[PDB]
Design goal:
set domain protein methyltransferase, domain 2; 2 domains; four-stranded antiparallel beta sheet; four-stranded mixed beta sheet; globular; binds S-adenosylmethionine; Rubisco_LSMT_subst-bd_sf; S-adenosyl-L-methionine binding; protein-lysine N-methyltransferase activity
């Protein structure tokens, strides 16, 4: 209302140009602020432009010099500490150049990320989805960074970081904010740090989106990808995001069947386990491990990775195909490979039942094992979803979690049907 007008004046001040066809709004959006079409917009049409000088990053912030100098000491797994420090500084700086931009940020105490749920609820509602494991990894990293890197830096520079921002609670919130708002510019292999992009981060997300961002030398442009009728919300794409990633990083899910990009994971070692099951002799077991190490050699599998299965097609396509091939090939043929190019081809809803029986059997057994990692079967979740009055009675978190589990189990059951 007031903050929106103030933000738009700031836009004018920093050269951020919005098309007259778009409006920043809180009415009729899927969530909080969003952008709507004042007038019908056509595909290819420029929606807005953001000068690179208006981005908020470790480089444009007022302590960019100090941060760059100390880059080595600020390294971490995420690579997000300098941006986080940039944010913590600007937030406590009396004359921050981005104040009107911050004014549109969500209430930091009300973020919906599962990292903010009680651990029991998280573990209970999201078992098997990959979220609980990702979150505990996040919390571990956050913890080490804070005590060994961030807090000491802030304390080494009292003038640049006031007391009110030396807060673990705040640090957690800002990590979540970066996860859900920041943009990472593609390279061209030292990946670009994430940056905050004003205006662009007003747009909500859909798998079926109608806008996307383009990078240029001097600016970022948000452009329409489909026509957008008058009064309709303008949706960016945050990526090809499965529900488990949306809930983890953004604190929301798309209800079924909306998320055409949804996926399920089969752990790579679970396929190995399935292969071992069918073995009888300890000598058969080791040929399996032999096959496995050859696949690790080829960098097609790894002890900690997962194959990724989409609704219509496998995403980790060559990895899975190459694994199935190598695991099911005659012992003889495998000798000639360990001595003397990877496997091509797609794996889709239509292709999979035409694969060799042995590949299908291996895939089938790995899927059964994956489905066993969840607390309940598909039928239970399908029951909660089919009856809308029962669904409506679940808490918000339970609804979100059910959508993650359901999306994943449906994909896995589809694959179960396809592999007979
Ligand atoms: C880049 S911000 C988008 C602007 C945001 N609506 C706001 O008011 O600040 C990303 C956040 O918006 C929300 N969001 C984006 N798309 C959504 C969707 N399709 N459904 C529900 N929430 C969504 C989530 O809270 C997510 O963390």
């Amino acid at each position: 209302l007031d903050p929106v007008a103030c933000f738009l004046s700031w836009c004018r001040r920093v050269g951020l140009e919005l098309s007259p066809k778009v409006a920043v709004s809180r009415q009729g959006t899927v969530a909080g602020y969003g952008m709507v079409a004042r007038e019908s917009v056509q595909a290819g049409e420029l929606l807005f432009v953001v000068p690179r000088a208006a981005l908020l990053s470790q480089h444009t912030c007022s302590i960019g010099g100090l941060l760059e100098r100390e880059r080595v000491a600020l390294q971490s797994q995420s690579g997000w500490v300098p941006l986080l420090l940039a944010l913590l500084h600007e937030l406590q700086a009396p004359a921050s150049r981005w104040r009107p931009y911050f004014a549109l940020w969500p209430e930091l105490g009300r973020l919906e990320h599962p990292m903010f749920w009680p651990e029991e609820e998280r573990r209970c509602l999201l078992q098997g989805t990959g979220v609980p494991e990702a979150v505990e990894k996040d919390l571990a990293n956050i913890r080490s960074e804070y005590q060994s890197i961030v807090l000491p830096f802030m304390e080494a520079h009292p003038d640049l970081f006031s007391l009110r921002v030396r807060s673990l609670e705040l640090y957690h919130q800002l990590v979540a904010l970066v996860m859900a708002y920041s943009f990472q510019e593609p390279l061209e292999k030292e990946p670009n740090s994430p940056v905050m992009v004003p205006a662009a981060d007003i747009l909500n997300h859909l798998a079926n989106h109608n806008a996307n961002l383009e990078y240029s030398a001097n600016c970022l442009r948000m452009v329409a990808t489909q026509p957008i009728p008058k009064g309709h919300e303008i949706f960016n794409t945050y990526g090809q995001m499965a529900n488990w990633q949306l809930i983890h990083m953004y604190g929301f899910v798309e209800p079924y069947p909306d998320n055409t990009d949804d996926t399920a994971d089969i752990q790579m070692v679970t396929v190995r386990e399935a292969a071992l099951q069918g073995t009888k002799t300890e000598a058969e077991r080791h040929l399996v491990y032999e096959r496995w190490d050859f696949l690790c050699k080829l960098e097609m599998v790894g002890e900690e990775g997962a194959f990724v299965i989409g609704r219509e097609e496998v995403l980790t396509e060559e990895e899975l195909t190459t694994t199935l091939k190598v695991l099911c090939m005659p012992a003889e043929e495998f000798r000639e490979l360990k001595d003397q190019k990877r496997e091509e081809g797609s794996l889709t809803i239509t292709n999979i039942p035409k694969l060799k029986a042995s590949w299908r059997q291996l895939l089938q057994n790995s899927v059964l094992l994956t489905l066993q990692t969840y607390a309940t079967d598909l039928k239970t979740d399908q029951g909660l979803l089919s009856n809308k009055e029962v669904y409506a009675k679940l808490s918000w978190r339970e609804q979100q979690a059910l959508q993650v589990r359901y999306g994943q189990k449906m994909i896995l059951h589809q694959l179960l049907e396809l592999t007979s």
